[PDB]
Amino acid sequence: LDVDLETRIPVINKVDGTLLVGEDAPRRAELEMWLQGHPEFAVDPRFLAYMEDRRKQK
């Protein structure tokens, strides 16, 4: 119950709009440093909504 790091985080360029998915999008493990280099990109907000969706109780 984590993200488990090997997952692919969909990222979106907040300036441009380019959304990266699949292997175009970085590994969650590299994502931390990857975003540090380019704050232009951030995580996909719908992926965050997906985490909102992911719940453990009713």
Side-chain angles (χ1 to χ4, degrees):
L1 285 301
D2 192 279
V3 72
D4 188 63
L5 299 178
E6 295 181 80
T7 203
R8 312 303 298 201
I9 299 300
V11 292
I12 180 177
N13 190 279
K14 305 298 288 293
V15 186
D16 174 272
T18 301
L19 178 64
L20 306 181
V21 295
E23 298 186 284
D24 199 306
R27 305 177 187 210
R28 176 61 180 209
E30 67 185 281
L31 183 285
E32 193 66 72
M33 295 179 295
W34 194 81
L35 295 184
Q36 293 180 270
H38 285 257
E40 298 175 76
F41 291 93
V43 301
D44 171 73
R46 185 64 188 210
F47 184 78
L48 296 182
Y50 182 70
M51 290 301 182
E52 302 299 291
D53 186 273
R54 176 176 289 200
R55 52 200 59 156
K56 47 184 172 59
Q57 296 183 330
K58 291 186 175 183

Short mmCIF file of all heavy atoms in Angstrom, two decimals:
data_model
loop_
_atom_site.label_atom_id
_atom_site.label_comp_id
_atom_site.label_asym_id
_atom_site.label_seq_id
_atom_site.Cartn_x
_atom_site.Cartn_y
_atom_site.Cartn_z
N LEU A 1 0.85 -1.18 0.00
CA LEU A 1 0.00 0.00 0.00
C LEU A 1 0.89 1.23 0.00
O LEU A 1 1.20 1.83 1.04
CB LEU A 1 -1.03 0.03 1.16
CG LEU A 1 -2.27 -0.90 1.04
CD1 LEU A 1 -3.07 -0.59 -0.22
CD2 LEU A 1 -1.90 -2.37 1.08
N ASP A 2 1.36 1.51 -1.17
CA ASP A 2 2.32 2.53 -1.46
C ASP A 2 2.16 2.78 -2.95
O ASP A 2 1.10 2.43 -3.51
CB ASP A 2 3.73 1.94 -1.17
CG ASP A 2 4.86 2.96 -1.13
OD1 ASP A 2 5.36 3.36 -2.20
OD2 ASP A 2 5.28 3.35 -0.03
N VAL A 3 3.12 3.34 -3.58
CA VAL A 3 3.10 3.50 -5.01
C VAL A 3 4.04 2.41 -5.59
O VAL A 3 3.97 2.05 -6.77
CB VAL A 3 3.55 4.93 -5.41
CG1 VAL A 3 5.03 5.13 -5.21
CG2 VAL A 3 3.12 5.26 -6.82
N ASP A 4 4.95 1.93 -4.71
CA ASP A 4 5.87 0.79 -4.94
C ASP A 4 7.07 1.12 -5.87
O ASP A 4 7.90 0.27 -6.20
CB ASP A 4 5.10 -0.49 -5.30
CG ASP A 4 5.96 -1.73 -5.34
OD1 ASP A 4 6.53 -2.11 -4.30
OD2 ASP A 4 6.06 -2.36 -6.42
N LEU A 5 7.13 2.38 -6.29
CA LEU A 5 8.28 3.00 -7.01
C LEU A 5 8.53 2.54 -8.47
O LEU A 5 8.99 3.35 -9.28
CB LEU A 5 9.58 2.92 -6.19
CG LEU A 5 9.55 3.64 -4.83
CD1 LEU A 5 10.86 3.44 -4.10
CD2 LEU A 5 9.26 5.12 -5.00
N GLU A 6 8.23 1.30 -8.81
CA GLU A 6 8.49 0.82 -10.17
C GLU A 6 7.40 1.24 -11.14
O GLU A 6 7.52 1.03 -12.35
CB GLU A 6 8.64 -0.69 -10.21
CG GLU A 6 9.83 -1.24 -9.47
CD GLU A 6 9.91 -2.74 -9.59
OE1 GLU A 6 10.40 -3.25 -10.62
OE2 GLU A 6 9.48 -3.44 -8.66
N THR A 7 6.35 1.81 -10.61
CA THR A 7 5.24 2.25 -11.41
C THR A 7 5.64 3.44 -12.31
O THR A 7 6.67 4.12 -12.07
CB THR A 7 4.03 2.63 -10.49
OG1 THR A 7 2.81 2.54 -11.24
CG2 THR A 7 4.16 4.05 -9.97
N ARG A 8 4.84 3.70 -13.33
CA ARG A 8 5.08 4.80 -14.24
C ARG A 8 4.14 5.92 -13.83
O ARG A 8 2.92 5.73 -13.82
CB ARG A 8 4.77 4.41 -15.70
CG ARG A 8 5.37 3.08 -16.16
CD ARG A 8 6.88 3.01 -16.00
NE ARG A 8 7.60 4.02 -16.80
CZ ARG A 8 8.90 3.91 -17.14
NH1 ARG A 8 9.60 2.84 -16.79
NH2 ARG A 8 9.48 4.89 -17.82
N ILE A 9 4.69 7.04 -13.43
CA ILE A 9 3.87 8.18 -13.08
C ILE A 9 3.59 9.05 -14.29
O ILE A 9 4.53 9.55 -14.91
CB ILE A 9 4.54 9.05 -11.99
CG1 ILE A 9 4.76 8.25 -10.73
CG2 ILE A 9 3.72 10.32 -11.69
CD1 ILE A 9 3.48 7.70 -10.10
N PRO A 10 2.31 9.22 -14.66
CA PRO A 10 1.94 10.11 -15.72
C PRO A 10 2.24 11.54 -15.29
O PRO A 10 1.83 11.97 -14.19
CB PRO A 10 0.42 9.92 -15.89
CG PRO A 10 0.07 8.72 -15.08
CD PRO A 10 1.15 8.55 -14.05
N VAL A 11 2.96 12.24 -16.09
CA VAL A 11 3.34 13.59 -15.77
C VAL A 11 2.85 14.52 -16.84
O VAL A 11 2.72 14.13 -18.00
CB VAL A 11 4.88 13.75 -15.58
CG1 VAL A 11 5.35 13.03 -14.34
CG2 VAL A 11 5.63 13.25 -16.80
N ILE A 12 2.58 15.71 -16.47
CA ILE A 12 2.09 16.69 -17.38
C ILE A 12 2.91 17.97 -17.24
O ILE A 12 3.28 18.36 -16.13
CB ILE A 12 0.56 16.97 -17.15
CG1 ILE A 12 0.03 18.03 -18.13
CG2 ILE A 12 0.27 17.36 -15.70
CD1 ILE A 12 -1.45 18.30 -18.02
N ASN A 13 3.26 18.55 -18.36
CA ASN A 13 3.96 19.81 -18.37
C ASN A 13 2.94 20.88 -18.08
O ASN A 13 2.02 21.09 -18.86
CB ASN A 13 4.61 20.08 -19.73
CG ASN A 13 5.56 21.28 -19.70
OD1 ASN A 13 5.13 22.41 -19.78
ND2 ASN A 13 6.84 21.02 -19.66
N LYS A 14 3.09 21.56 -16.97
CA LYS A 14 2.11 22.53 -16.50
C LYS A 14 2.15 23.83 -17.31
O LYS A 14 1.23 24.65 -17.23
CB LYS A 14 2.34 22.81 -15.00
CG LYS A 14 2.32 21.55 -14.13
CD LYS A 14 0.97 20.82 -14.18
CE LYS A 14 -0.12 21.56 -13.42
NZ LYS A 14 0.13 21.60 -11.96
N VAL A 15 3.19 24.02 -18.08
CA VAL A 15 3.32 25.21 -18.89
C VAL A 15 2.71 24.94 -20.26
O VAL A 15 1.78 25.62 -20.70
CB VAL A 15 4.81 25.61 -19.07
CG1 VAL A 15 4.94 26.95 -19.79
CG2 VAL A 15 5.54 25.64 -17.74
N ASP A 16 3.23 23.92 -20.90
CA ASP A 16 2.83 23.53 -22.23
C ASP A 16 1.49 22.81 -22.23
O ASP A 16 0.50 23.31 -22.77
CB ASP A 16 3.91 22.64 -22.86
CG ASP A 16 3.51 22.09 -24.20
OD1 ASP A 16 2.88 21.01 -24.23
OD2 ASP A 16 3.79 22.71 -25.23
N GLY A 17 1.46 21.67 -21.58
CA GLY A 17 0.27 20.87 -21.56
C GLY A 17 0.55 19.42 -21.91
O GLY A 17 -0.29 18.56 -21.69
N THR A 18 1.73 19.16 -22.48
CA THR A 18 2.16 17.80 -22.85
C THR A 18 1.99 16.80 -21.68
O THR A 18 2.57 16.99 -20.60
CB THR A 18 3.64 17.79 -23.34
OG1 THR A 18 3.78 18.65 -24.48
CG2 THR A 18 4.08 16.39 -23.73
N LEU A 19 1.18 15.78 -21.90
CA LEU A 19 0.93 14.74 -20.92
C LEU A 19 1.69 13.48 -21.34
O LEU A 19 1.54 13.01 -22.47
CB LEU A 19 -0.58 14.44 -20.83
CG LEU A 19 -0.99 13.32 -19.85
CD1 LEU A 19 -0.66 13.68 -18.41
CD2 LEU A 19 -2.47 13.01 -19.99
N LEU A 20 2.48 12.96 -20.44
CA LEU A 20 3.30 11.79 -20.72
C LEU A 20 2.74 10.59 -19.99
O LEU A 20 2.50 10.65 -18.78
CB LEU A 20 4.74 12.04 -20.24
CG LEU A 20 5.43 13.30 -20.75
CD1 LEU A 20 6.85 13.38 -20.22
CD2 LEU A 20 5.43 13.34 -22.26
N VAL A 21 2.53 9.51 -20.72
CA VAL A 21 2.02 8.27 -20.13
C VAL A 21 2.86 7.08 -20.61
O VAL A 21 3.63 7.19 -21.58
CB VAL A 21 0.52 8.01 -20.47
CG1 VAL A 21 -0.38 9.07 -19.84
CG2 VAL A 21 0.30 7.96 -21.97
N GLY A 22 2.71 5.95 -19.93
CA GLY A 22 3.43 4.75 -20.30
C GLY A 22 4.89 4.84 -19.95
O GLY A 22 5.25 5.36 -18.89
N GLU A 23 5.75 4.39 -20.85
CA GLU A 23 7.18 4.44 -20.62
C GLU A 23 7.76 5.75 -21.11
O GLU A 23 8.97 5.99 -21.02
CB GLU A 23 7.93 3.26 -21.23
CG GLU A 23 7.53 1.91 -20.65
CD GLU A 23 8.39 0.79 -21.18
OE1 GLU A 23 8.19 0.37 -22.33
OE2 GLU A 23 9.27 0.32 -20.45
N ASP A 24 6.90 6.59 -21.60
CA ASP A 24 7.29 7.93 -21.99
C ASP A 24 7.41 8.71 -20.69
O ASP A 24 8.28 9.55 -20.51
CB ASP A 24 6.23 8.54 -22.86
CG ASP A 24 6.71 9.74 -23.68
OD1 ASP A 24 7.26 10.69 -23.12
OD2 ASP A 24 6.48 9.74 -24.91
N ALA A 25 6.54 8.33 -19.77
CA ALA A 25 6.51 8.89 -18.46
C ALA A 25 7.56 8.15 -17.62
O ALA A 25 7.75 6.94 -17.81
CB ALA A 25 5.13 8.72 -17.87
N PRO A 26 8.25 8.85 -16.73
CA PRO A 26 9.34 8.28 -15.93
C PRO A 26 8.88 7.27 -14.87
O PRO A 26 7.67 7.17 -14.54
CB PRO A 26 9.93 9.51 -15.23
CG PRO A 26 8.79 10.45 -15.14
CD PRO A 26 8.03 10.28 -16.41
N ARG A 27 9.83 6.50 -14.35
CA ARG A 27 9.55 5.59 -13.26
C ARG A 27 9.32 6.43 -12.04
O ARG A 27 9.90 7.50 -11.91
CB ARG A 27 10.74 4.66 -12.95
CG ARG A 27 11.25 3.86 -14.12
CD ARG A 27 12.46 3.03 -13.73
NE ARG A 27 13.09 2.37 -14.88
CZ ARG A 27 13.75 1.20 -14.84
NH1 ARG A 27 13.83 0.49 -13.71
NH2 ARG A 27 14.31 0.74 -15.95
N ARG A 28 8.53 5.95 -11.14
CA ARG A 28 8.27 6.67 -9.91
C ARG A 28 9.55 6.85 -9.08
O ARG A 28 9.72 7.85 -8.39
CB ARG A 28 7.18 5.97 -9.11
CG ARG A 28 6.86 6.58 -7.76
CD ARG A 28 6.38 8.01 -7.83
NE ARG A 28 6.08 8.57 -6.52
CZ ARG A 28 5.16 9.53 -6.27
NH1 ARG A 28 4.43 10.05 -7.26
NH2 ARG A 28 4.99 9.97 -5.04
N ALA A 29 10.45 5.89 -9.20
CA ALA A 29 11.73 5.94 -8.51
C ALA A 29 12.58 7.12 -8.97
O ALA A 29 13.20 7.80 -8.16
CB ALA A 29 12.47 4.64 -8.72
N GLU A 30 12.57 7.40 -10.27
CA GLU A 30 13.39 8.48 -10.82
C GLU A 30 12.62 9.81 -10.75
O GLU A 30 13.23 10.87 -10.68
CB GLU A 30 13.78 8.18 -12.28
CG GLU A 30 12.62 8.17 -13.24
CD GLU A 30 12.99 7.75 -14.63
OE1 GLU A 30 13.54 8.57 -15.39
OE2 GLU A 30 12.70 6.61 -15.00
N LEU A 31 11.29 9.69 -10.70
CA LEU A 31 10.33 10.79 -10.73
C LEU A 31 10.70 11.90 -9.74
O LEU A 31 10.65 13.08 -10.10
CB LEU A 31 8.90 10.20 -10.46
CG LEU A 31 7.65 11.12 -10.50
CD1 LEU A 31 7.52 12.01 -9.27
CD2 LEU A 31 7.63 11.94 -11.77
N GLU A 32 11.11 11.51 -8.55
CA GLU A 32 11.50 12.45 -7.50
C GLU A 32 12.58 13.42 -8.01
O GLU A 32 12.41 14.64 -8.00
CB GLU A 32 12.03 11.66 -6.30
CG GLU A 32 12.18 12.47 -5.03
CD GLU A 32 10.84 12.93 -4.49
OE1 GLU A 32 10.09 12.10 -3.97
OE2 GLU A 32 10.53 14.14 -4.58
N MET A 33 13.66 12.86 -8.54
CA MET A 33 14.78 13.66 -9.05
C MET A 33 14.43 14.29 -10.38
O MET A 33 14.88 15.40 -10.70
CB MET A 33 16.02 12.79 -9.22
CG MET A 33 16.58 12.23 -7.94
SD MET A 33 18.03 11.18 -8.22
CE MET A 33 17.32 9.83 -9.17
N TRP A 34 13.62 13.59 -11.15
CA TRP A 34 13.24 13.99 -12.49
C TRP A 34 12.47 15.33 -12.45
O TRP A 34 12.76 16.25 -13.22
CB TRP A 34 12.39 12.88 -13.10
CG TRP A 34 12.17 12.98 -14.57
CD1 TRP A 34 13.04 12.59 -15.55
CD2 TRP A 34 11.01 13.48 -15.24
NE1 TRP A 34 12.50 12.83 -16.78
CE2 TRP A 34 11.25 13.37 -16.62
CE3 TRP A 34 9.80 14.01 -14.81
CZ2 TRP A 34 10.32 13.77 -17.57
CZ3 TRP A 34 8.88 14.40 -15.75
CH2 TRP A 34 9.15 14.28 -17.12
N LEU A 35 11.53 15.43 -11.52
CA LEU A 35 10.76 16.65 -11.32
C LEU A 35 11.62 17.79 -10.78
O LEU A 35 11.37 18.96 -11.07
CB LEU A 35 9.52 16.43 -10.44
CG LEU A 35 8.43 15.51 -11.00
CD1 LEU A 35 7.24 15.46 -10.06
CD2 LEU A 35 8.00 15.95 -12.38
N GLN A 36 12.61 17.45 -9.97
CA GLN A 36 13.53 18.45 -9.43
C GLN A 36 14.29 19.17 -10.54
O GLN A 36 14.58 20.36 -10.44
CB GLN A 36 14.51 17.82 -8.45
CG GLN A 36 13.89 17.30 -7.17
CD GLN A 36 14.92 16.69 -6.25
OE1 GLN A 36 15.22 15.50 -6.31
NE2 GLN A 36 15.49 17.50 -5.39
N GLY A 37 14.60 18.45 -11.60
CA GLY A 37 15.33 19.03 -12.71
C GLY A 37 14.47 19.93 -13.57
O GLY A 37 14.94 20.95 -14.09
N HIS A 38 13.19 19.59 -13.67
CA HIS A 38 12.25 20.31 -14.50
C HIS A 38 10.91 20.43 -13.81
O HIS A 38 10.05 19.56 -13.94
CB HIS A 38 12.05 19.68 -15.90
CG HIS A 38 13.18 19.90 -16.86
ND1 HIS A 38 13.14 20.83 -17.89
CD2 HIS A 38 14.39 19.30 -16.96
CE1 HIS A 38 14.29 20.76 -18.55
NE2 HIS A 38 15.09 19.84 -18.02
N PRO A 39 10.72 21.52 -13.04
CA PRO A 39 9.46 21.78 -12.32
C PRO A 39 8.30 22.10 -13.27
O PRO A 39 7.17 22.32 -12.84
CB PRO A 39 9.77 22.98 -11.44
CG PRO A 39 11.00 23.60 -12.02
CD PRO A 39 11.72 22.55 -12.79
N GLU A 40 8.61 22.13 -14.57
CA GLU A 40 7.64 22.30 -15.62
C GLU A 40 6.65 21.16 -15.58
O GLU A 40 5.48 21.32 -15.84
CB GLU A 40 8.32 22.25 -16.98
CG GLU A 40 9.34 23.32 -17.24
CD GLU A 40 10.03 23.08 -18.54
OE1 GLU A 40 9.44 23.35 -19.61
OE2 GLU A 40 11.17 22.58 -18.54
N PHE A 41 7.16 19.99 -15.25
CA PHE A 41 6.36 18.82 -15.17
C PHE A 41 5.92 18.60 -13.76
O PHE A 41 6.64 18.93 -12.81
CB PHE A 41 7.12 17.59 -15.66
CG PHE A 41 7.39 17.55 -17.13
CD1 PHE A 41 8.58 18.04 -17.64
CD2 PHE A 41 6.46 17.02 -18.00
CE1 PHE A 41 8.83 17.99 -19.00
CE2 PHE A 41 6.70 16.96 -19.35
CZ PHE A 41 7.88 17.45 -19.85
N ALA A 42 4.76 18.08 -13.63
CA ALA A 42 4.21 17.70 -12.38
C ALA A 42 3.44 16.44 -12.62
O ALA A 42 3.30 16.03 -13.77
CB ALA A 42 3.31 18.78 -11.82
N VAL A 43 2.96 15.83 -11.57
CA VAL A 43 2.21 14.61 -11.70
C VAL A 43 0.84 14.91 -12.31
O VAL A 43 0.31 16.02 -12.16
CB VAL A 43 2.04 13.89 -10.33
CG1 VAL A 43 3.40 13.55 -9.73
CG2 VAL A 43 1.22 14.73 -9.35
N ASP A 44 0.31 13.95 -13.03
CA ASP A 44 -1.02 14.07 -13.60
C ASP A 44 -2.06 14.18 -12.49
O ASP A 44 -2.14 13.30 -11.62
CB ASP A 44 -1.32 12.88 -14.51
CG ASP A 44 -2.76 12.84 -14.97
OD1 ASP A 44 -3.15 13.65 -15.83
OD2 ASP A 44 -3.51 12.00 -14.47
N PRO A 45 -2.86 15.26 -12.49
CA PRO A 45 -3.87 15.48 -11.46
C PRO A 45 -4.95 14.41 -11.46
O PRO A 45 -5.56 14.14 -10.42
CB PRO A 45 -4.48 16.83 -11.82
CG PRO A 45 -3.50 17.48 -12.73
CD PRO A 45 -2.80 16.37 -13.45
N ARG A 46 -5.18 13.77 -12.59
CA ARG A 46 -6.17 12.72 -12.66
C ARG A 46 -5.64 11.47 -11.97
O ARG A 46 -6.40 10.68 -11.43
CB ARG A 46 -6.61 12.43 -14.11
CG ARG A 46 -7.75 11.42 -14.21
CD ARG A 46 -9.01 11.95 -13.56
NE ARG A 46 -10.07 10.94 -13.48
CZ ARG A 46 -11.38 11.19 -13.52
NH1 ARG A 46 -11.82 12.45 -13.59
NH2 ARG A 46 -12.24 10.19 -13.44
N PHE A 47 -4.33 11.29 -11.99
CA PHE A 47 -3.68 10.21 -11.28
C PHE A 47 -3.82 10.46 -9.78
O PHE A 47 -3.96 9.53 -8.98
CB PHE A 47 -2.21 10.08 -11.69
CG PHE A 47 -1.50 8.92 -11.07
CD1 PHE A 47 -1.69 7.63 -11.55
CD2 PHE A 47 -0.65 9.10 -9.98
CE1 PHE A 47 -1.04 6.56 -10.98
CE2 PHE A 47 -0.01 8.03 -9.40
CZ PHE A 47 -0.21 6.75 -9.90
N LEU A 48 -3.83 11.72 -9.40
CA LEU A 48 -4.07 12.08 -8.02
C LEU A 48 -5.53 11.80 -7.67
O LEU A 48 -5.83 11.29 -6.61
CB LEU A 48 -3.70 13.54 -7.74
CG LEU A 48 -2.23 13.91 -7.91
CD1 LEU A 48 -2.02 15.37 -7.55
CD2 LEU A 48 -1.35 13.02 -7.05
N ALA A 49 -6.42 12.09 -8.61
CA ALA A 49 -7.84 11.79 -8.46
C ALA A 49 -8.06 10.28 -8.39
O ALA A 49 -8.98 9.79 -7.73
CB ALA A 49 -8.63 12.40 -9.61
N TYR A 50 -7.20 9.54 -9.05
CA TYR A 50 -7.20 8.10 -9.02
C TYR A 50 -6.81 7.60 -7.62
O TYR A 50 -7.31 6.57 -7.15
CB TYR A 50 -6.24 7.56 -10.09
CG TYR A 50 -6.20 6.07 -10.18
CD1 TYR A 50 -7.28 5.36 -10.67
CD2 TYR A 50 -5.08 5.36 -9.75
CE1 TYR A 50 -7.26 4.00 -10.74
CE2 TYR A 50 -5.06 3.98 -9.82
CZ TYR A 50 -6.15 3.31 -10.32
OH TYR A 50 -6.13 1.94 -10.38
N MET A 51 -5.93 8.34 -6.96
CA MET A 51 -5.55 8.03 -5.59
C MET A 51 -6.66 8.40 -4.63
O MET A 51 -6.81 7.79 -3.58
CB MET A 51 -4.22 8.68 -5.20
CG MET A 51 -3.01 8.07 -5.88
SD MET A 51 -2.84 6.30 -5.53
CE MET A 51 -1.33 5.92 -6.40
N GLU A 52 -7.45 9.41 -4.99
CA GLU A 52 -8.64 9.79 -4.22
C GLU A 52 -9.66 8.65 -4.34
O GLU A 52 -10.34 8.26 -3.37
CB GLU A 52 -9.29 11.05 -4.81
CG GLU A 52 -8.40 12.27 -4.89
CD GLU A 52 -7.91 12.73 -3.55
OE1 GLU A 52 -8.72 13.21 -2.74
OE2 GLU A 52 -6.69 12.65 -3.30
N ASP A 53 -9.74 8.13 -5.55
CA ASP A 53 -10.62 7.03 -5.90
C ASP A 53 -10.23 5.78 -5.12
O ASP A 53 -11.10 5.06 -4.61
CB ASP A 53 -10.50 6.76 -7.40
CG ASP A 53 -11.46 5.72 -7.91
OD1 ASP A 53 -11.14 4.52 -7.87
OD2 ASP A 53 -12.53 6.10 -8.41
N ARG A 54 -8.93 5.54 -5.01
CA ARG A 54 -8.42 4.41 -4.26
C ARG A 54 -8.66 4.61 -2.77
O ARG A 54 -8.04 5.48 -2.13
CB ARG A 54 -6.92 4.17 -4.56
CG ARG A 54 -6.30 3.05 -3.73
CD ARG A 54 -4.86 2.77 -4.13
NE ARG A 54 -4.75 2.12 -5.45
CZ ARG A 54 -3.68 1.43 -5.87
NH1 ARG A 54 -2.57 1.39 -5.14
NH2 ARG A 54 -3.71 0.79 -7.04
N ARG A 55 -9.56 3.85 -2.24
CA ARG A 55 -9.94 3.95 -0.86
C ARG A 55 -9.89 2.58 -0.22
O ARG A 55 -9.76 1.57 -0.91
CB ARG A 55 -11.30 4.65 -0.74
CG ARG A 55 -12.40 4.06 -1.59
CD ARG A 55 -13.52 5.06 -1.78
NE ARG A 55 -13.03 6.30 -2.44
CZ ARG A 55 -13.77 7.16 -3.15
NH1 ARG A 55 -15.05 6.92 -3.38
NH2 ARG A 55 -13.20 8.26 -3.64
N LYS A 56 -9.99 2.56 1.08
CA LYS A 56 -9.80 1.34 1.84
C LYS A 56 -11.02 0.94 2.67
O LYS A 56 -11.09 -0.18 3.18
CB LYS A 56 -8.53 1.46 2.71
CG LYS A 56 -8.43 2.78 3.48
CD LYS A 56 -7.11 2.89 4.24
CE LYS A 56 -6.92 4.28 4.84
NZ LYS A 56 -7.99 4.66 5.78
N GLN A 57 -11.96 1.84 2.82
CA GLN A 57 -13.18 1.56 3.54
C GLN A 57 -14.33 2.21 2.83
O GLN A 57 -14.14 3.10 2.01
CB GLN A 57 -13.13 2.10 4.98
CG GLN A 57 -12.08 1.47 5.87
CD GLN A 57 -12.13 2.00 7.28
OE1 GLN A 57 -12.50 3.14 7.51
NE2 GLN A 57 -11.76 1.18 8.21
N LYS A 58 -15.52 1.75 3.12
CA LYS A 58 -16.69 2.39 2.60
C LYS A 58 -17.17 3.42 3.57
O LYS A 58 -17.76 3.08 4.61
CB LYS A 58 -17.82 1.41 2.28
CG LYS A 58 -17.54 0.49 1.11
CD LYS A 58 -18.76 -0.34 0.78
CE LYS A 58 -18.54 -1.18 -0.46
NZ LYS A 58 -19.75 -1.93 -0.82
#
